[PDB]
Assembly symmetry: C3
């Protein structure tokens, strides 16, 4: 035979359940093959890739990753691709797991305002990436045109308590990481495989803080994990936990009891986790500068009873989660909007600075600015700061070392430079400091920082 030889479609056609990340459609829960009608529409739209940073995404179903598709092995799928009339570009679809030329791309070419259709049998069980395959293919994928399709085995997957949808992608902005405004696609960075962001589910903080995934102690969690690329291979890892199982695509091999696993560009895996201890468990790309400098972190938050026999210790997770430990960074979004409108207040800056100060400065100066006597000097009521508040701009951008004295105490240490911070970020952080802990007040502007950055 062929694989997936389960008989002809039976019953009425089914109009398929699509879901937006991070949710999954329900199990199909049937024992017969069906004709499944899938309707998916392309929408090109601006969304926030980071706080105060807009990007023109190209999407399947209005999200990155695109809508999740769920069918049964042996189903006949009638696929309808619509391209919204607001689109500027033509689009198509290639579904991994399809048996046929281009995985559909050859038959789904769709101009703005049009619709295409093609039909395929799902022979191949597994989790599979789908993506646009319109020239230039790389640009389409880089702009967010990918998602997952699950083809269930005929008996269905084993029951779990939660199923989630998480997809990594690499993104290429003309501006640098966290540079505000509408950021165009940068073809030069893309060709060179030098992304400015590496993200889960299309944005920094998409799955952190108040947007974390949830489960309880004792529960099992399945995550359908994709890597849309376009270019990067993920050293996919869960901090502080282990995967009971990892299965790639439709593969017969299943790895068990691993914590770090390589997902190819265009690859997908199903992972399973059992919650044992409460807290935040972090999904990262363990090519570590991606996770901690470019946005590649997502959270699964577990609630329930402690188990001190398994893990007994403090819970100070801002030291690595940094500015993503908090529920959100909406103050940054708001300050950026106000700056664009020309209505930025001191308090707007202060609250944005407060959000950014977490991790970035607090790891050494503490959340209250007290420092640690003799080791990290205070920012709280700092005579050194007050003596020349402007010099703080140079200190942040270019670091500080050597002997200094602060609130009558000697320091001889090293503060690394932080030149990667953008002008608004430095301004906002310093404005927060100046207006906290009985410091002199005032404000620093982005334009002030720009001038200091530019001196030799």
């Amino acid at each position: 035979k062929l694989p997936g030889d389960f008989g002809p479609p039976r019953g009425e056609p089914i109009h398929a359940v699509l879901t937006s990340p991070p949710l999954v459609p329900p199990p199909v829960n049937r024992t017969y093959p069906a004709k499944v009608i899938v309707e998916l529409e392309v929408v090109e739209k601006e969304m926030q890739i980071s706080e105060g940073v807009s990007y023109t995404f190209w999407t399947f179903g209005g999200t990155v990753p695109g809508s999740f598709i769920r069918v049964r092995q042996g189903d006949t799928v009638e696929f309808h691709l619509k391209n919204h009339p607001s689109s500027k570009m033509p689009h198509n679809i290639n579904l991994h797991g399809v048996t046929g030329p281009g995985g559909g791309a050859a038959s789904s070419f769709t101009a703005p305002g049009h619709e295409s259709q093609f039909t395929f049998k799902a022979l191949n069980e597994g989790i599979y990436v789908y993506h646009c395959a319109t020239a230039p293919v790389g640009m389409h994928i880089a702009n967010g045109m990918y998602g997952l399709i699950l083809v269930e085995p005929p008996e269905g997957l084993p029951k779990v308590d939660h199923e989630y949808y998480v997809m990594q992608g690499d993104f290429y902005t003309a501006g640098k990481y966290r540079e505000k405004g509408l950021q165009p696609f940068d073809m030069e960075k893309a060709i060179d495989e030098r992304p400015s962001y590496v993200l889960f589910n299309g944005a920094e903080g998409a799955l952190t803080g108040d947007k974390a995934l949830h489960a309880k102690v004792g529960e099992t969690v399945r995550i359908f994990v994709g890597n849309g690329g376009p270019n990067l291979v993920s050293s996919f890892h869960v901090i502080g936990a282990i995967f009971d199982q990892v299965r790639y695509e439709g593969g017969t091999n299943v790895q068990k009891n691993v914590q770090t696993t390589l997902i190819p560009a265009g690859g997908a895996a199903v992972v399973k986790f059992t919650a044992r201890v409460p807290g935040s468990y972090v999904l990262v790309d363990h090519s570590i500068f991606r996770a901690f400098n470019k946005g590649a972190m997502a959270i699964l938050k577990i609630d329930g009873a402690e188990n001190k026999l398994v893990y007994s210790g403090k819970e100070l997770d801002s030291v690595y989660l940094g500015d993503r430990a908090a529920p959100n960074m909406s103050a940054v979004t708001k300050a950026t909007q106000a700056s664009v409108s020309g209505t930025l207040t001191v308090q707007d800056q202060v609250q944005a600075g407060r959000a950014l100060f977490a991790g970035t400065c607090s790891v050494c100066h503490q959340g209250n600015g007290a420092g640690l006597p003799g080791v990290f000097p205070p920012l709280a009521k700092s005579d050194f700061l007050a003596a020349d508040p402007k010099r703080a701009m140079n200190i942040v951008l270019h670091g500080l070392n050597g002997k200094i004295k602060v609130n009558g105490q000697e320091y001889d240490s090293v503060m690394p430079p932080m030149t990667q911070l953008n002008d608004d970020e430095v301004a906002n952080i310093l404005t927060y400091v100046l207006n906290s802990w009985d410091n002199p007040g005032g404000r620093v502007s982005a334009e002030d920082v720009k001038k200091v950055r530019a001196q030799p």
Copy 2:
């Protein structure tokens, strides 16, 4: 014992069958261990890495990848490496799967005009990369000095209908992708792992168009897949199909039913495919900018009956294959030769432009230049073009957006910049357009494009 303990060589020595890519030597078809004499010669030679782009390759047996070697586990191999007297460099060989220092490299050091020999027992069954290991090793490998050796299990591999040889490599030219002429090796790009080309079998289009691999519906195909590197890891994938099996080197684990698989730098795998539906099936490195911007695409073309129950849809594959959908791009080769000779005609430019227009422009403007009314403006008999044919150079290089009117119709859309196109490519494409569809004619030269590219 050791592994491969099958007895002493029997019979007469065998003088081994070497083959050029993409073919494989026949199965050894024997039940006893032999002494196998291998003779392989290094040749340094210019070949075309892309149409009109020459490169000085360093080769084992005159090809990239080098000649395929096939032996049986337990054989004693007497290896003779010759370095042709025309070579400028010394060379040697390291065969993965050899048990001994340097995999042979230590004993096969061979100056131009000389020959070396060493003997090894093939203890280890599997598919293995071989490559040069002469300082600087990276430069030798980057210049094309790698291939595969198969060491069969004693009972032989299972019968299939076709066996093919495909090897990925990353290449480092001083010039940019598709910049014409003889391109030197670029050490700086190589150290930084920033290749200009990523190719199967040593050239763009080596396995596309009229050079595709072939099979029929129902047939099984084994591909011996290598990654010579030097630096890249391939997210190796078949578009529109699945691998029945993937086996790395001589490993005991075999993965089944996967579509995307990671091949390490210096790694090799045996994959198996069963043809089910007619059409072109694309082998790519799914770090997508490699596949679609740097040459990393190869084709397996399947002929036979349609199976509409499995796949039913149109077959417009130029939308992703682009300029590699056609049998070849020989017009580009020819135009480049003519340009070098100072005998480039308008028609030379037109035919080269026609080849490059596929995908690159046709995805939006159509193959006939008609566009799509209101969405993509026409190039065919375009008043906007005719009004200022020179401005077309800026449109290609730097894009166009905003309200415009063309053949009495309003457009308000976005044409992305295409700055990665080389000066000759832009010139040739525009010359094609000007001389097609009752457009005004004339020509654009590479020197014209160069001037426009250089303005602020």
Copy 3:
């Protein structure tokens, strides 16, 4: 239950055995669960990353990688992290394999002069990376803050003759590869994943020459292999041998009989090797420019009887090991110290040049400078050199091609440029040549080379 449900700790607390690379603590050799007290101290210190190149490493226990920790699955581990008072930075620890938030990082935040403690049960058997997780996490890891923890299965691992500890890392210096002096961390290179060094065990030559690992023909060797990253994925490979087994972390799957294996950033594997033939077996990252241009090579040296039936050939391994074939390159270290002190002699330069000449020049000009008549011209008593010893600086930096005559013999070949050599390296190499083989003598200085490099 949970996994690792073996009963409560019994007996007295055990104060755990830590070891420095490349050694491993002994097998725990017990059949009951224990309370294990681990004491690990962070020390920030300058060490030599390469000969004459210093770097400020941040370390767990004074080494890179950090001290190896060995416990039994089911143990309760009381972990004490001390941060030495000389440290400038705060630090913490995340142990992969820990079940709990941050793998401990959340509870081990430790300022200079302080100590922290947290307790965890080792539920998960396997080899696991541990690393610092203090913001900015990437900088901490890049500076060398990683190591391995082994959690044994309850019955212990199978007996082998040797166990070794090898950990890859990528490093980011402001200066270029082999540029002398104290090299700061370079954040820009790190974010871009463009390392200047890629090393085993924290330094070039850490495991080469007289620092190689050892075993004998017939013996089995287990290596606990880590990849600390921060960013790179290793195409981990043994030259001239094969791995009997490769097992990732605590995974249930075990691959057998492979030579090349991908280790994720933050990943760890246990590999097993059986010595069959004498010689040097090279562990590399087979992204080849890492192994041969950035330091990613380590040696296992096997002593014992030859087996000519398995491998019969010469042993000229300087052709690929290059300057790492010799016991060390201490002459380079010494010349650099002398240069810094202003006491650099001609002989200091000569001996440093001699060390660097191996591979770099000897592959073509031979170890004795004789060249090969008609193919590679002589450096020994070279009239061409003597005629204009200064022009040798341009020859090394920028190459030489075309017809030339040397000791009354015609050459028409190509010497590639070697611009990646640093000014001191070129100076020292040429000083060696001038003072060898009855050449005219004199010296070339680094400042001379600097001037020539800077001309147009």
